[PDB]
A paper describes a structure:
The E166A substitution blocks the deacylation reaction, which allows trapping of the acyl-enzyme intermediate. As with the ampicillin structure, the carbonyl oxygen of the β-lactam in the cefotaxime acyl-enzyme is in position to hydrogen-bond with the main-chain Ser70-N and Thr237-N in the oxyanion hole. Also, similar to the E166A/K234R/AMP structure, Ser130 is in a −49° χ1 rotamer conformation, and the hydroxyl group forms two hydrogen bonds with the Arg234 guanidinium. The Ser130 Oγ is 3.9 Å from the cefotaxime N5 leaving group nitrogen, which is outside of the hydrogen-bonding range. In addition, the Ser130 Oγ is 7.8 Å from the Lys73 Nζ and is not in position to accept a proton as proposed in the catalytic mechanism. In contrast, Ser130 is critical for cefotaxime acylation, and consequently the change in conformation with the hydroxyl turned away from Lys73 and the β-lactam N5 nitrogen drastically reduces catalysis.
The CTX-M β-lactamases are class A enzymes that have a broad substrate specificity that includes penicillins and cephalosporins, including the oxyimino-cephalosporin cefotaxime. Acylation is facilitated by the transfer of a proton from Ser130, via a proton shuttle from Lys73, to the leaving group nitrogen of the amide. In addition, Lys234 is located near the proton shuttle residue, Ser130, and may act to lower the pKa of the serine hydroxyl to facilitate proton transfer to the nitrogen leaving group of the β-lactam during the acylation reaction. Structural results suggest that the slow acylation by the K234R enzyme is due to a conformational change in Ser130, and this change also leads to decreased inhibition potency of clavulanic acid.
Residue numbers in the entry: 27 to 57, 59 to 238, 240 to 252, 254 to 289
The structure:
Protein backbone atom coordinates (compact mmCIF):
# COMPACT_ATOMS: atom_id res chain seq x y z
CA UNK A 1 0.00 0.00 0.00
CA UNK A 2 1.02 3.63 -0.45
CA UNK A 3 1.12 4.05 3.34
CA UNK A 4 3.58 1.16 3.69
CA UNK A 5 6.07 2.73 1.28
CA UNK A 6 5.61 6.02 3.14
CA UNK A 7 6.46 4.31 6.44
CA UNK A 8 9.36 2.36 4.94
CA UNK A 9 10.83 5.67 3.77
CA UNK A 10 10.33 7.17 7.24
CA UNK A 11 12.11 4.14 8.69
CA UNK A 12 14.95 4.49 6.18
CA UNK A 13 15.07 8.19 7.13
CA UNK A 14 15.36 7.28 10.82
CA UNK A 15 18.23 4.78 10.82
CA UNK A 16 16.25 2.48 13.11
CA UNK A 17 13.55 -0.20 13.10
CA UNK A 18 9.91 0.90 13.02
CA UNK A 19 6.81 -1.14 13.83
CA UNK A 20 3.27 0.10 13.20
CA UNK A 21 -0.19 -1.42 13.58
CA UNK A 22 -3.37 0.53 12.88
CA UNK A 23 -6.90 -0.79 13.43
CA UNK A 24 -9.59 1.10 11.53
CA UNK A 25 -12.78 0.10 13.34
CA UNK A 26 -14.87 1.16 10.33
CA UNK A 27 -14.30 -2.04 8.32
CA UNK A 28 -11.77 -3.83 10.58
CA UNK A 29 -9.09 -2.98 8.04
CA UNK A 30 -5.51 -2.85 9.27
CA UNK A 31 -2.28 -1.13 8.29
CA UNK A 32 0.82 -3.03 9.38
CA UNK A 33 4.53 -2.25 9.09
CA UNK A 34 6.70 -4.95 10.67
CA UNK A 35 3.43 -5.88 12.35
CA UNK A 36 4.62 -9.36 13.37
CA UNK A 37 8.16 -8.51 14.49
CA UNK A 38 8.90 -8.35 18.20
CA UNK A 39 9.70 -5.01 19.83
CA UNK A 40 10.59 -4.21 23.45
CA UNK A 41 7.36 -2.87 24.94
CA UNK A 42 9.04 -0.77 27.65
CA UNK A 43 6.47 1.27 29.64
CA UNK A 44 3.64 0.55 27.18
CA UNK A 45 3.33 -2.69 29.17
CA UNK A 46 1.69 -0.55 31.88
CA UNK A 47 -1.62 -0.76 29.98
CA UNK A 48 -1.75 -4.54 30.36
CA UNK A 49 -0.81 -4.35 34.05
CA UNK A 50 -3.34 -1.62 34.86
CA UNK A 51 -6.06 -3.47 32.92
CA UNK A 52 -5.28 -6.69 34.79
CA UNK A 53 -5.84 -4.91 38.11
CA UNK A 54 -9.05 -3.41 36.72
CA UNK A 55 -10.18 -6.94 35.84
CA UNK A 56 -9.54 -8.00 39.44
CA UNK A 57 -11.64 -5.05 40.63
CA UNK A 58 -14.69 -6.46 38.82
CA UNK A 59 -14.82 -9.06 41.62
CA UNK A 60 -13.06 -7.07 44.38
CA UNK A 61 -15.29 -4.01 44.21
CA UNK A 62 -13.24 -1.78 46.54
CA UNK A 63 -9.82 -2.84 45.22
CA UNK A 64 -8.99 0.53 43.65
CA UNK A 65 -9.25 2.26 47.05
CA UNK A 66 -6.90 -0.21 48.77
CA UNK A 67 -3.92 1.66 50.29
CA UNK A 68 -0.43 0.49 49.34
CA UNK A 69 2.64 1.43 51.36
CA UNK A 70 5.41 3.28 49.54
CA UNK A 71 8.72 2.42 51.22
CA UNK A 72 12.20 3.84 50.48
CA UNK A 73 13.25 0.41 49.20
CA UNK A 74 10.45 0.48 46.60
CA UNK A 75 12.06 3.40 44.75
CA UNK A 76 13.69 2.62 41.41
CA UNK A 77 15.06 4.64 38.49
CA UNK A 78 12.08 6.94 37.78
CA UNK A 79 9.58 7.61 40.53
CA UNK A 80 7.89 11.01 39.97
CA UNK A 81 4.65 10.42 41.88
CA UNK A 82 5.65 7.61 44.26
CA UNK A 83 8.58 9.62 45.64
CA UNK A 84 6.03 12.16 46.95
CA UNK A 85 4.39 9.51 49.17
CA UNK A 86 7.35 7.61 50.64
CA UNK A 87 6.69 6.48 54.23
CA UNK A 88 2.97 6.92 53.48
CA UNK A 89 0.45 5.16 51.22
CA UNK A 90 -1.14 5.45 47.79
CA UNK A 91 -4.27 3.70 46.58
CA UNK A 92 -4.22 1.26 43.68
CA UNK A 93 -6.22 3.83 41.71
CA UNK A 94 -3.60 6.49 42.46
CA UNK A 95 -0.86 4.02 41.50
CA UNK A 96 -2.65 3.14 38.26
CA UNK A 97 -2.94 6.83 37.39
CA UNK A 98 0.71 7.45 38.25
CA UNK A 99 1.81 4.59 35.99
CA UNK A 100 -0.46 5.48 33.07
CA UNK A 101 -0.15 9.29 33.23
CA UNK A 102 3.41 9.91 34.47
CA UNK A 103 5.32 6.70 33.56
CA UNK A 104 5.99 6.04 37.25
CA UNK A 105 7.99 2.81 37.48
CA UNK A 106 7.39 2.29 41.20
CA UNK A 107 3.66 2.44 40.45
CA UNK A 108 4.11 -0.19 37.72
CA UNK A 109 5.83 -2.49 40.22
CA UNK A 110 2.94 -2.09 42.67
CA UNK A 111 0.56 -3.18 39.90
CA UNK A 112 2.80 -6.16 39.11
CA UNK A 113 2.94 -7.10 42.80
CA UNK A 114 -0.86 -6.93 43.07
CA UNK A 115 -1.05 -9.46 40.21
CA UNK A 116 1.46 -11.85 41.81
CA UNK A 117 4.48 -11.00 39.68
CA UNK A 118 5.10 -10.45 35.96
CA UNK A 119 3.51 -13.83 35.25
CA UNK A 120 0.22 -12.36 36.45
CA UNK A 121 0.40 -9.69 33.75
CA UNK A 122 1.16 -12.21 31.00
CA UNK A 123 -1.66 -14.38 32.36
CA UNK A 124 -4.19 -11.60 31.86
CA UNK A 125 -2.95 -11.15 28.29
CA UNK A 126 -3.55 -14.83 27.55
CA UNK A 127 -6.96 -14.63 29.24
CA UNK A 128 -8.06 -11.94 26.74
CA UNK A 129 -6.66 -13.78 23.70
CA UNK A 130 -3.22 -12.14 23.40
CA UNK A 131 -0.83 -15.05 22.81
CA UNK A 132 2.10 -12.77 21.90
CA UNK A 133 2.55 -10.39 24.85
CA UNK A 134 5.11 -11.48 27.44
CA UNK A 135 6.15 -9.64 30.59
CA UNK A 136 9.21 -11.24 32.19
CA UNK A 137 10.71 -8.62 34.52
CA UNK A 138 9.73 -5.83 36.88
CA UNK A 139 10.64 -2.20 36.42
CA UNK A 140 13.10 -0.89 35.51
CA UNK A 141 14.86 -3.91 33.96
CA UNK A 142 11.89 -4.65 31.67
CA UNK A 143 13.04 -1.61 29.64
CA UNK A 144 16.55 -2.83 28.75
CA UNK A 145 15.40 -3.13 25.11
CA UNK A 146 18.39 -5.24 24.06
CA UNK A 147 18.26 -6.17 20.34
CA UNK A 148 16.99 -9.71 19.88
CA UNK A 149 16.04 -10.24 23.53
CA UNK A 150 12.60 -11.94 23.61
CA UNK A 151 11.90 -10.74 27.15
CA UNK A 152 9.25 -8.06 27.68
CA UNK A 153 8.27 -7.92 24.00
CA UNK A 154 5.18 -8.03 21.84
CA UNK A 155 4.33 -7.37 18.21
CA UNK A 156 2.52 -4.28 16.88
CA UNK A 157 -0.39 -6.37 15.57
CA UNK A 158 -0.98 -8.07 18.93
CA UNK A 159 -0.77 -4.87 20.98
CA UNK A 160 -3.20 -3.03 18.71
CA UNK A 161 -5.81 -5.78 19.03
CA UNK A 162 -5.39 -5.90 22.81
CA UNK A 163 -5.65 -2.12 23.23
CA UNK A 164 -8.90 -2.05 21.24
CA UNK A 165 -10.55 -4.73 23.41
CA UNK A 166 -9.39 -3.02 26.61
CA UNK A 167 -10.53 0.50 25.70
CA UNK A 168 -13.33 0.01 23.15
CA UNK A 169 -14.26 -3.67 23.48
CA UNK A 170 -15.54 -5.64 26.45
CA UNK A 171 -12.39 -7.31 27.76
CA UNK A 172 -13.16 -5.26 30.90
CA UNK A 173 -16.33 -4.24 32.66
CA UNK A 174 -17.91 -0.96 31.61
CA UNK A 175 -16.86 0.96 34.73
CA UNK A 176 -13.34 -0.46 34.33
CA UNK A 177 -13.12 0.28 30.60
CA UNK A 178 -14.25 3.86 31.25
CA UNK A 179 -11.67 4.28 34.03
CA UNK A 180 -8.89 3.06 31.73
CA UNK A 181 -10.11 5.47 29.05
CA UNK A 182 -10.04 8.38 31.51
CA UNK A 183 -6.52 7.40 32.62
CA UNK A 184 -5.22 7.15 29.05
CA UNK A 185 -6.82 10.43 27.94
CA UNK A 186 -5.10 12.13 30.88
CA UNK A 187 -1.59 10.90 30.09
CA UNK A 188 0.98 13.68 30.37
CA UNK A 189 3.95 12.03 28.61
CA UNK A 190 2.65 11.74 25.03
CA UNK A 191 2.55 15.29 23.63
CA UNK A 192 5.52 14.73 21.29
CA UNK A 193 4.61 11.18 20.21
CA UNK A 194 1.43 10.00 18.36
CA UNK A 195 -0.50 13.09 19.52
CA UNK A 196 1.94 15.38 17.68
CA UNK A 197 1.13 13.75 14.33
CA UNK A 198 -2.67 13.84 14.45
CA UNK A 199 -5.27 16.55 13.74
CA UNK A 200 -5.94 18.69 16.81
CA UNK A 201 -9.67 17.87 16.71
CA UNK A 202 -9.10 14.15 17.37
CA UNK A 203 -9.30 12.94 21.00
CA UNK A 204 -6.43 10.65 22.02
CA UNK A 205 -5.51 8.55 25.00
CA UNK A 206 -2.09 6.99 24.84
CA UNK A 207 0.73 5.43 26.86
CA UNK A 208 4.36 5.92 25.96
CA UNK A 209 7.50 3.93 26.64
CA UNK A 210 11.22 4.29 26.17
CA UNK A 211 14.40 2.40 26.86
CA UNK A 212 17.98 1.83 25.83
CA UNK A 213 18.89 1.61 22.14
CA UNK A 214 16.86 4.78 21.66
CA UNK A 215 13.70 2.73 22.04
CA UNK A 216 10.70 5.05 21.69
CA UNK A 217 7.16 3.69 21.87
CA UNK A 218 3.58 4.89 21.97
CA UNK A 219 0.25 3.06 21.86
CA UNK A 220 -2.92 5.08 21.43
CA UNK A 221 -6.66 4.88 20.91
CA UNK A 222 -7.89 7.66 18.65
CA UNK A 223 -11.39 9.11 18.28
CA UNK A 224 -11.58 11.28 15.18
CA UNK A 225 -14.77 13.84 14.04
CA UNK A 226 -17.92 11.79 13.43
CA UNK A 227 -16.28 8.53 12.38
CA UNK A 228 -15.25 5.13 13.72
CA UNK A 229 -12.36 5.17 16.23
CA UNK A 230 -8.78 4.15 15.53
CA UNK A 231 -6.17 2.10 17.39
CA UNK A 232 -2.51 2.85 16.66
CA UNK A 233 0.72 1.23 17.87
CA UNK A 234 4.06 2.83 16.98
CA UNK A 235 7.22 1.07 18.20
CA UNK A 236 10.74 2.20 17.31
CA UNK A 237 14.22 1.03 18.30
CA UNK A 238 17.73 1.75 17.08
CA UNK A 239 21.11 0.04 16.59
CA UNK A 240 23.15 2.17 19.03
CA UNK A 241 22.92 1.36 22.74
CA UNK A 242 23.11 5.07 23.64
CA UNK A 243 20.86 6.29 20.82
CA UNK A 244 18.70 9.30 21.63
CA UNK A 245 14.92 9.30 21.91
CA UNK A 246 13.07 9.73 18.61
CA UNK A 247 9.48 10.65 19.50
CA UNK A 248 9.36 12.59 16.22
CA UNK A 249 9.37 9.24 14.40
CA UNK A 250 6.18 8.18 16.19
CA UNK A 251 4.56 11.53 15.39
CA UNK A 252 5.54 11.18 11.73
CA UNK A 253 4.20 7.62 11.56
CA UNK A 254 0.87 8.77 13.01
CA UNK A 255 0.68 11.61 10.48
CA UNK A 256 1.27 9.09 7.69
CA UNK A 257 -1.45 6.80 8.99
CA UNK A 258 -3.77 9.77 9.42
CA UNK A 259 -3.25 10.83 5.79
CA UNK A 260 -4.58 7.46 4.61
C1 LIG B 1 9.15 2.93 30.48
O1 LIG B 1 9.35 2.93 29.30
C2 LIG B 1 10.18 3.60 31.46
N1 LIG B 1 11.53 3.56 30.92
C3 LIG B 1 12.58 3.32 31.72
O2 LIG B 1 12.48 3.22 32.94
C4 LIG B 1 13.89 3.14 31.04
N2 LIG B 1 14.75 2.69 31.88
O3 LIG B 1 14.75 1.28 31.89
C5 LIG B 1 15.94 0.84 32.56
C6 LIG B 1 14.48 4.05 30.06
C7 LIG B 1 15.76 3.93 29.64
S1 LIG B 1 16.15 5.16 28.50
C8 LIG B 1 14.53 5.78 28.67
N3 LIG B 1 14.13 6.86 27.99
N4 LIG B 1 13.77 5.11 29.52
C9 LIG B 1 9.61 5.07 31.70
N5 LIG B 1 8.92 5.53 30.50
C10 LIG B 1 9.02 6.73 30.08
C11 LIG B 1 8.25 7.05 28.84
O4 LIG B 1 7.08 7.39 28.89
O5 LIG B 1 8.92 6.92 27.72
C12 LIG B 1 9.80 7.83 30.64
C13 LIG B 1 10.17 8.88 29.92
C14 LIG B 1 10.13 7.67 32.10
S2 LIG B 1 11.00 6.09 32.30
Amino acid sequence: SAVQNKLAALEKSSGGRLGVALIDTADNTQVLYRGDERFPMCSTSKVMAAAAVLKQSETQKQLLNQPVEIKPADLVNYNPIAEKHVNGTMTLAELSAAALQYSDNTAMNKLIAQLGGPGGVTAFARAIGDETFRLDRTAPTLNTAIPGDPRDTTTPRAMAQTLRQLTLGHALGETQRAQLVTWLKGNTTGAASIRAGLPTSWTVGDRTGSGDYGTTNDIAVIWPNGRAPLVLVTYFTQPQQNAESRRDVLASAARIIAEG
